[PDB]
Symmetry: C2
Amino acid sequence: PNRISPELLATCGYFMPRIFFLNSQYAPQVHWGDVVAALSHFPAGNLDLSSEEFWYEWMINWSKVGDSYINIANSAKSEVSHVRALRSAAACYHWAEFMYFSDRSRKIQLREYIRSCFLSSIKYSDLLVDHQYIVVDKFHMPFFLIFPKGYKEEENHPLPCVILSNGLDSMTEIEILSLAEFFLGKNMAVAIFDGPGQGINLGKSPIAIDMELYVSSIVKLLEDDARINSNLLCFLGISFGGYFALRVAQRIGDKFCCIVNLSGGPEIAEFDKLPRRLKEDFQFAFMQDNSHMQSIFDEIKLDISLPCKTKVFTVHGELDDIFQIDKVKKLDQLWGDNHQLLCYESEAHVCLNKINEYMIQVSDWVSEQFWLNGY
Amino acid sequence: PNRISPELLATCGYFMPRIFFLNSQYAPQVHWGDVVAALSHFPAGNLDLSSEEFWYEWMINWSKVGDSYINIANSAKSEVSHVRALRSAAACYHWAEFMYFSDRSRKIQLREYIRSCFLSSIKYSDLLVDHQYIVVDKFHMPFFLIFPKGYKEEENHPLPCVILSNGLDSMTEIEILSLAEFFLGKNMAVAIFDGPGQGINLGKSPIAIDMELYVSSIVKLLEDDARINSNLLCFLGISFGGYFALRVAQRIGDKFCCIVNLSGGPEIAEFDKLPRRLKEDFQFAFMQDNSHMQSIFDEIKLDISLPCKTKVFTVHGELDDIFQIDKVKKLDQLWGDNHQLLCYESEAHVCLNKINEYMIQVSDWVSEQFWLNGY
C-alpha cells in the first residue's frame, strides 16, 4: 500500500502545517494524497533535513506529482476540471521548489510553472483580477488587484484594500492568496505583488530590505484607483514579510488604518545559529554568499525607538527560532497601545498549527480597524 | 512545541487521507493544525487501533477541538467568520464520532452538533438548499436538494441531478457534500439524504439493506420537481453506499443515465476477519449483536447474474480489505460493457490517496454520460 514511511512523517512534522497551509477556494492547495504521492517512493536512509541531498529528492519527487496533475489538466474534459488540476499542479510545484536552492534555473522554472497555472486559473475563475506591472524606478513589479466574489463597480462604494507581502520562500498565489481570501470573504479588495526577490522574482533580483518603497508605489496606485478607498488600507506581511510590515509601520504607517505582522520581528536571530536550510534560504533570496549574510542581518535590524505610525497586530509563537519572541515583546512594550501581540505559548515560527484560528481573529480585527476609521 | 507524536502519526496513516478528505468550499474540513490540537496531548502508550480505549480518547480529544471552534463561532464578529468556525467545529465533531460506537447517546449528540452547524452554515451561504422530509411509508427521511452557485430557475433549463449516498460511517454534510461539490461545480443539482441508519439517523434506526426503496422516493420527488431533469439522473455511492449503488443499478438502474460506485462491492469480506473496529462499525449501523452480523452479510451478498440496467463506473483499490477486488472484478467481467472499472494497484478501501484525481475523472465521466443521453 502507498503510504509515507513512519521515519519521513516523524521527520517532516514542522513543514506539514506549512505544506497543507489554509483551506482555500482559489489559492492552490495539496490533498493528503499528494503528500503520499510525493513521499511514498522517497529514498530510505535520506532524513537529514539540513542536507542538500534531502531537498533535491524532495524537489524531484514533488515535481513528479506536479507533472501528473498537468497531464490531468491537459486531458481534462471541462474548464472546472482543468482549473482543479492546474491548482493541484501549482501547489505541488511550489512545495517542490520552496526549500530548493541548488539549481537557480530549475527553481525559477518551477515558479514560472506556478505563475502560468495561476494566470490560467484566473481566466476561468469568478474573481475580477487586475494584473499589471507597477514601475518603481527601473523595476517592473508584477501586481495583482483582486476584487471580491461578484464585485460590480456601481453596486459598491470604494472598497477597503489589504496589501499582502510575501515571506522569504512563499509564492504570491499560494500562501499570500490563501491569506488574502479571508479579506476577499469580507468584501475587501486585496493587493498581492512580486517585489524584488519575491514570488516570480525570487532568484532573478535580490530581495529589497527597503520594501516599503515598493509598497508606497502600490499605495499611489490604489489612491488613483476609483474602486479603492485609499483611506481604508491595511498592510499584512507573513514571516520575513512581517518584518516588512514593521518597516511599513515605521516609515509609511500613516497611509494605513492598520498593519498585520504574522510572525515577523525587528531583527533576525544569529545567521550562523540558523538551521542550515534557512541559511541557504536567506542566501538565495539576497543572492549573496554565506560570509556576507550576517552583515545584511545587521543592516536589517530595526531601530525600535522609531515608533509605528498606525495600529499593529502581531501574531507570534514563543518557540520562533528565526524572529525570537524576546525582541518582539521588547517592541510590543515600547510601541505600547498601538501594538497588540497575540502570543501562542507552544508554537514555532508563524504559528501554523493555529493559522485557521488566528486568521479568523486577524480578519475580524482588520474589519474593526476599518470600522474605527468610519467604514 | 505542539506536535503529533511519531508513534501516533505512524499508527494513524490510513485514516489520515479519510480525515483530510477533499478540499471543499462548503463541506466542513479540518486543517492540519486541528489534527495537531486533537492528537498533541493524546495519551502515550495508547496505540491499539482495534481497542475501545483508543477511540474513546480519540473522541474526547477531537471533541475538545470541536468545542474550541464553537467558542470562536459564538464570539465571531462577522457572519463569514461565524460560518468558517462552525464548519471547522463540524469537521472536528465528525472525526470525534465516526469511529466511536461505545456511547450511542454521545455519538448521536455529536452528529446533532454537526447537523446544527450545517443548517446554520446554509443560512449564510450562497447555495439554494431545499431541505425537507421525504415520507417513505412511516419513515421521515431528511433530504437536501442543493442547486449550483448563482442558480436561477428561469436562467436555466431543468438541471441534471446526482443523488449521493452515505457510507457506513460518513456524515451527509461532510464526505458526501464534499463529493457533491464536484457536480455542483459543473452546474448540476445534487441530492443528499439521510436514509435509515445513515447520517443523522445513524444509531436511531438500523441501516436498510434495501436502500433503493428510499432512492426510488427521491427519484419520484425529482420527477415532480420542474427544476430537475429526471431523464438526466446519476446515483453515486461511497464505500457501503457503493454497495447500494450496485443494488440501485440492478433494481432501478433504468431511472439513471449512469451510476458511480466508489469502492463498494457485491459482497463484504468475512465479518470475523474484519479489523475489530469495522466489526463495531457494522454492528452499530445495523443495531445488531456480533453473533447476528455474518447472517446479515450473507443477506447483503448480491446475485451478480442479475444485470445492471445502466452504465456503472467503479473506482476500487486492489488492497481493499472490506470489499475484496476479486469479487468486484468478477462483477466487472459479467456486467461487461455496461461496467467500467478504475482499479488502483497499491490503494486500500476507497483509494483515498487518489480521491482528488479520481473525482475529477468521475465528474467528467458523469458529464459525458449526460451528454450521451442528449444534454
